[PDB]
Design an enzyme around this catalytic site. Structure first.
Site, mmCIF file in Angstrom:
data_model
loop_
_atom_site.group_PDB
_atom_site.id
_atom_site.type_symbol
_atom_site.label_atom_id
_atom_site.label_comp_id
_atom_site.label_asym_id
_atom_site.label_seq_id
_atom_site.Cartn_x
_atom_site.Cartn_y
_atom_site.Cartn_z
ATOM 1 N N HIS A 103 0.866 -1.170 -0.069
ATOM 2 C CA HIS A 103 0.059 0.163 0.050
ATOM 3 C C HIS A 103 0.843 1.399 0.100
ATOM 4 O O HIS A 103 0.652 2.014 -0.969
ATOM 5 C CB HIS A 103 -0.978 -0.276 1.129
ATOM 6 C CG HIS A 103 -1.783 -1.021 1.166
ATOM 7 N ND1 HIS A 103 -2.236 -1.652 0.145
ATOM 8 C CD2 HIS A 103 -2.462 -1.478 2.331
ATOM 9 C CE1 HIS A 103 -3.479 -2.495 0.414
ATOM 10 N NE2 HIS A 103 -3.403 -2.722 1.516
ATOM 11 N N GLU A 152 1.261 3.902 -3.532
ATOM 12 C CA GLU A 152 0.861 5.557 -3.493
ATOM 13 C C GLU A 152 2.121 6.073 -3.653
ATOM 14 O O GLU A 152 1.968 6.970 -4.426
ATOM 15 C CB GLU A 152 0.605 5.631 -1.859
ATOM 16 C CG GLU A 152 -0.852 5.119 -1.430
ATOM 17 C CD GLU A 152 -1.998 5.758 -2.097
ATOM 18 O OE1 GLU A 152 -1.882 6.721 -3.070
ATOM 19 O OE2 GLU A 152 -3.154 4.912 -2.702
ATOM 20 N N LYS A 199 2.852 5.925 -7.520
ATOM 21 C CA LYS A 199 1.783 6.436 -8.541
ATOM 22 C C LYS A 199 2.113 7.980 -8.417
ATOM 23 O O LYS A 199 1.979 8.479 -9.614
ATOM 24 C CB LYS A 199 0.446 6.174 -7.875
ATOM 25 C CG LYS A 199 -0.330 4.877 -8.271
ATOM 26 C CD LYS A 199 -1.753 4.828 -7.917
ATOM 27 C CE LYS A 199 -1.903 4.835 -6.310
ATOM 28 N NZ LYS A 199 -3.372 4.667 -5.823
ATOM 29 N N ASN A 200 2.416 8.518 -7.210
ATOM 30 C CA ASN A 200 2.697 9.837 -7.209
ATOM 31 C C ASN A 200 4.126 10.137 -8.150
ATOM 32 O O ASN A 200 4.082 11.216 -8.638
ATOM 33 C CB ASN A 200 3.024 10.381 -5.667
ATOM 34 C CG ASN A 200 1.606 10.221 -4.901
ATOM 35 O OD1 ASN A 200 0.495 10.174 -5.517
ATOM 36 N ND2 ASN A 200 1.799 10.228 -3.702
HETATM 37 N N1 LIG Z 1 4.831 10.833 -2.763
HETATM 38 C C1 LIG Z 1 5.547 11.473 -3.491
HETATM 39 C C2 LIG Z 1 5.910 12.383 -4.512
HETATM 40 C C3 LIG Z 1 7.158 11.987 -5.481
HETATM 41 N N2 LIG Z 1 7.180 12.975 -6.428
HETATM 42 C C4 LIG Z 1 6.284 13.977 -6.302
HETATM 43 N N3 LIG Z 1 6.345 14.973 -6.723
HETATM 44 C C5 LIG Z 1 5.390 15.830 -6.489
HETATM 45 C C6 LIG Z 1 4.202 15.679 -5.681
HETATM 46 C C7 LIG Z 1 4.231 14.324 -4.942
HETATM 47 C C8 LIG Z 1 5.447 13.480 -5.200
#
Ligand SMILES: N#Cc1c[nH]c2ncccc12
Ligand SMILES: N#Cc1c[nH]c2ncccc12
Ligand SMILES: [Cl-]
Ligand SMILES: [Cl-]
Lengths: 341, 341
Positions: free
Chosen positions: A228, A232, A235-236
């Site tokens: 999990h 996350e 994905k970010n």
């Molecule tokens: N978690 C995570 C992130 C890893 N890179 C990012 N860039 C902009 C906003 C959030 C992120």
């Protein structure tokens, strides 16, 4: 009804945090189902009453909302469901089978509490505003309410998964290969990234086993929790990498390092997705500021803290971001972190 | 004496934080000496009285110690020295020349306040103990007392350096090349490292100018403050690198990245000196826990915060450590951060 009475009584008790060893002992064999039942029929009403008492102490403007009243109704019914088993006999197999069925029902009843509590946050912002004091009180309560939830769902999963009528002990993997979980989470994030963006960064993994170089890094942990968090973060990081290189051809890879030390097992995820100004970092972990008409990071950090870990973000605006999951390397140091009541 | 009276009066006023632009305006030319005198003869008694009032509100066991009484005596005399100039005439050149001489004396009088306050911390640990509550109160006071000191010594340096009877405006460099300051601090740390260890890691610098690639990164800043932070970080990173590779031949280099974004100028220092467990990170920034019979990092962080920046450490036990200095890229966002009284 005796619901207010039960809350007052069981709120007097303190929750009992368990260690990884204790979890492995409860799940060593099916012969321990009776001990698990005797422990849970007292512990689960304790943990439920402590968080229910804190809910009742919220201000009237929060407590009277339909979201809180709905959640509270699901906590009252779940409590009463467990109370029925207090006088039952553990030696009766029917009592044990009914207890397992009751736990599955309770778990399913609370499956939608995270989007429901998110609806309440959005309502508060529009009804009373998004001031800093409100942010702190909401953050304080939800961190404790979501950590309590994680701990209660851990206990339920261990009982239902093991005593269902080995290598893995319920949700715990005593030989969890971290790199394999990293690959699994990347592969899922990649599938979603390719579908929505028609491009995905590659993955590079490097392991640093300080004490035993070139030996794969294993640990005792709950792989579903680790997935999990990594999912996350992937994905970010993928979103930022792809969107920041839309007008470029080279797509930098996402680099993951797994380091094993004497007491820390650290997982760093490094991307070159343009980074984020320091001012915006705190907002990423805020329930209220991440709510818009985005709880992956704050909840992910709670998963890390649940067994005495942490999750931290440090970015370099204009370049990229590093996201480090800190876990305890030793099962002796892996103990439940519960809300201080 | 009227010292208690002066403290009470000037403590009613709030300090006035200045921006980089305001600093450049005060130092644009020697014609502004009168304005600087008129501002400082009021502002310096305000800042001195506010921190002196907080000192007087410390518990009697801290206030009665020789260290605090000595420091307080130097703050009473410095206050009285400035009070003498309140009724003097700015148009008289002698008044201005005497004011500059008085500021140099005041600055020198306080030159040993950091080792003196460190002696007081050690005395407290041995006289009353090193409990967590004591740690927080000491950390709270010293952070504010050392940030106040930095702000007062900044004002004094700007007046004495410029109005002494250009490219640099006192201690401010409007075209500070960050990489050059990084090299200077490394070279000094290297000299000490080679002398004491007979080996030193090499240096690698990479610049990321997001908006104007391949263009050197410049900023408006106080290079002496930036040097102090980078020097402390280099010393710690070199010590860890050399000591962790004593039984090895390869000595990994220290890698520095300078990134310029829309609002952040970030400087990351990466080493492979074995890292530090997460549990020990907070102790590195604690005055009480770093005291032994080690304030470089906590004070370095205050220098970064003084102009709305920060300094953060994130390590990977078994591998190495990253130390990031966060600065404001724009002079408009660079404003004094003073203690909230
Ligand atoms: N978690 C995570 C992130 C890893 N890179 C990012 N860039 C902009 C906003 C959030 C992120
Ligand atoms: N600053 C800094 C450090 C950079 N690397 C370190 N390793 C051990 C302890 C402190 C540090
Ligand atoms: Cl829940
Ligand atoms: Cl001082």
């Amino acid at each position: 009804g005796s619901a207010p009475k039960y809350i007052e009584h069981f709120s007097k008790f303190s929750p009992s945090p368990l260690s990884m060893k204790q979890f492995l002992d409860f799940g060593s064999s099916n012969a321990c189902e009776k001990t698990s039942f005797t422990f849970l029929r007292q512990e689960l009403p304790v943990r439920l009453a402590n968080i229910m008492k804190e809910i009742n102490l919220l201000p009237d403007r929060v407590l009277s909302t339909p979201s809180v009243q709905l959640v509270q109704s699901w906590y009252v019914q779940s409590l009463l469901d467990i109370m029925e088993f207090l006088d039952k006999d553990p030696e009766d197999h029917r009592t044990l089978s009914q207890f397992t069925d009751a736990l599955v029902t309770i778990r399913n009843r609370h499956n939608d509490v995270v989007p429901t509590m998110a609806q309440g946050v959005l309502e508060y912002k529009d009804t009373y505003g998004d001031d800093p004091v409100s942010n702190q009180n909401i953050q304080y309560f939800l961190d404790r309410f979501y950590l309590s939830r994680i701990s209660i769902r851990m206990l339920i999963n261990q009982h239902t998964l093991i005593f269902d009528g080995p290598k893995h002990i319920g949700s715990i993997d005593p030989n969890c290969n971290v790199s394999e979980v990293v690959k699994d989470a990347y592969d899922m994030a990649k599938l979603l990234c390719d579908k929505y963006y028609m491009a995905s960064p590659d993955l590079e993994i490097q392991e640093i086993n300080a004490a035993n170089s070139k030996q794969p890094i294993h640990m005792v942990y709950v792989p579903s929790h680790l997935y999990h968090m990594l999912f996350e973060l992937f994905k970010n990081a993928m979103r930022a990498t792809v969107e920041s290189h839309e007008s470029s051809l080279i797509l930098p890879p996402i680099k993951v390092m797994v380091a094993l030390g004497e007491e820390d097992l650290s997982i760093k995820m490094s991307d070159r997705g343009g980074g984020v100004p320091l001012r915006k970092i705190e907002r990423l972990f805020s329930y209220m500021y991440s709510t818009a008409p985005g709880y992956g990071l704050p909840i992910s950090r709670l998963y890390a803290k649940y067994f005495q870990g942490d999750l931290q973000l440090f970015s370099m605006e204009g370049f990229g971001t590093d996201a480090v999951i800190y876990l305890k390397a030793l099962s002796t140091d892996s103990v439940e972190r519960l809300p201080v009541y």
